[model samples]
Target: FCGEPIDYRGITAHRLVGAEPRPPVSGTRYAKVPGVPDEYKTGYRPANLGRSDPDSDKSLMNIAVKNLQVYQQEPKLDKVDEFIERAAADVLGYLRFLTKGERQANLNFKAAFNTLDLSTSCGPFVPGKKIDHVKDGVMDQVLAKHLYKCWSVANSGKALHHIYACGLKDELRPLDGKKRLLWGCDVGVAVCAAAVFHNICYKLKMVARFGPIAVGVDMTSRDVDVIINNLTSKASDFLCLDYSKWDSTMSPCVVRLAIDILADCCEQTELTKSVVLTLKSHPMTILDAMIVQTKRGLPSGMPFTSVINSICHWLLWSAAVYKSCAEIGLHCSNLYEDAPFYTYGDDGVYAMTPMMVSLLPAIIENLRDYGLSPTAADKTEFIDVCPLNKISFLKRTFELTDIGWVSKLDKSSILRQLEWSKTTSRHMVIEETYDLAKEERGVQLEELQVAAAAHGQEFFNFVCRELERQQAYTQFSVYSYDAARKILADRKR
Candidate 1:
């Protein structure tokens, strides 16, 4: 080993990117701030305020809501400075779209065909914009018509379709600076949030009919009901015979069971559930590997083809649901709450409860000595090393696995990856980040040192420096989003 410490950070990396300072900001229907807010928080209204959109322009501010329906242009990073100028208008267009309604549309879901034009005309923004609306004919145009009609129903909150549990992997992932920090899932959450919005629209008859873009038609029940069902699926079994050795089927299945449970949730509920129940649960798995491998990949030198493929799936799924330009420009918000996966009173953690306490020491010892790459002969030893005697403080019972609410999510292996600032590989990530940030800003790091530190910001300092960033709380439409314009404008206004 070349003494290259792994990029082990901590839970900070798994932080949710947007809806920032918080997601689903209080008092807002549509984000306009539609992308991950970590990237940008402003949008164009009389003032500024809003949600984060994934697949956003370079600024990662307001969603390209109107850009897709209207001019349908994406901001390019090549002329990074120019993006600042253009994003304002684009942001305004987004606000106008929201206030005036897509000119030719409603706040509800658009038809799959109409959505295609929106999707095609607007984005894959970093690459280019294309419309994803107006396809096929009237038969398919209903989702949009119905969704627009339902927008009113969604705000009621009495009957929401899906809960849009946006960031699963980010919540659960152990951050290695590289994994959780750099390429995490802000956009995914934004898209999920948007989908929730679309679901309400469709159910309300806002758009006319349901479309795959807004909310999948296959939904089973409401999101809350699904949560309750998932609660019931927790394992009561403590241990089994030769189970450790069955890692091939067992370990993978451990993850699968988590997913399967979600599928079975909300079966009888009145609200919309997983249109594609599986449509969800699967992404968490991919997100897990992507974050893990992105951090560890270089050190392990294990080809991440599988990880890349997984990311692609997550990306496409998010794109379909959110229908905004912020998805690609997703910056991990790194917020405390809203993590994709949570450690509190969670079933997955309980499943490992037995192993959390009594067996923890041995398990850690074995992991250090032998790693999970155990030889066939070491099955019993491996099993012996698992912690199975955890005390469940929450339930006031003796757990077989004793894993706390955090479980492996807080495991040193994973948590260490996200605390990018404190990572073992901090030096490398910092260096790499500086390189990227430097390219984005004309000034060098040394020049901005005092200011950067004073602002309590790093790569994101460009968005809004300290005081200004905080002031974001007060605003109306997308809070006047403009990655470049806001930063510059803030300095002046």
Candidate 2:
């Protein structure tokens, strides 16, 4: 009953358990820390180890990004071009790195990206949707800096990190005659990892420690072969490594690809395409977008977008799991993406899609047959997520966080902007103008000019620009030539 030994707080020393649970197969031990004691003593502190998630509605990942303080997030394609060109020199340098480090002779790297002009009828698309007035290939200084910093923070390096960071947002937006889905997790992880450092962990001055994070890969996958002018045999072989094989070295990489891809292809999952997949994972959407942009006559409903997204997801998850297994640990993924703008459900809920309808029936049937065997693909519910109707997962995760970004934005402003953009949008549409001027869909507004005083060329042009800008179409993916055939041809050779 001595008071000295009775103090629980004073007993910093703890007893050990059995020869810490070792891999049953390997004689090598993984030293589990002592908690509930069983009396064996082994390794205490060892050499250093390290430490790290998107989405749409029902999709937790998208909702998570939406929950991210994304007031400054890049939001369009032309803006994406700006993101790319701002660091064109840096990007070029990175190409040099690839050639130097990974190749025989560091060949001069031709760009997969370029600037092109778009006609008013064809583009400056979704202008209102843009974060700013951006041409397709120019740079937004602030975002460029943020992304670079993010990559560095993630230790993703300056070379490839910048390329992917710059192009991520635009990759998600489909341009004229281009029908690709958006998920670029390869580069996404760096951006995300960096943001976690810069915005979440750093800005907040929380547990400001670098991690051997449990990063899962991303939103989509794509073939750079589609865009680059040429590739050596090694490059081709490297690019062609399939993510599905469960090899000793390859198993982890492939699994991450699988989860990221699964999430990206689902529209109920939008947030992932935007931030999580792009920010902290294996981002490659920019490469995908560049391929789509430079090439022409993209087949309708191409699966590149969805497939890339799904594949990256699998890669990312594998990375996360492996990192954890390696014991360079992190408790959370420390990743997030806002719900994708593409998700269509009203009032913070994900809108239903044909994919879900088709998939849900299968899920229901499967559940009836096997019961709740969720395997790895099943996701959590919407409210169980972040920043919807005012709950944020980020704030909750770190504990001592404030929702300043959301508060800084007037909630009313979102509604007002939506109201003005939507109302003015309809007021100037040919459909509405037809009611004002009395015309049909394909009939030129000029033909109905006599019916209404407001229905003149001046009105048409005015309405065109206003509606176009408001609808956020001012950004560019404008193609000047059909280099698609040539680019593909070059790759073939």
Best by lDDT: 1
In model 1, what lDDT does residue 214 have?
17
Where does candidate 1 stray beyond 4 Å?
Answer: 1-252, 263-274, 277-359, 363-493
Error of 2 at 167 (Å): 21
lDDT tens digits, residues 182-252, model 2? 22222223333222222221211221111111122110111212111111211221011112111111122
Candidate 1 local lDDT, residue 275:
28
Q: TM-score for all predictions?
A: 0.21, 0.20
Candidate 2 has what TM-score? 0.20
Give model 2's clash tally: 91
User: What's the TM for model 1?
Assistant: 0.21
lDDT of 1 by residue, 347-385 (tens): 111122332224433433332222122221222333322
Lowest summed lDDT over 10 consecutive residues: which window, candidate 2? Answer: 338-347
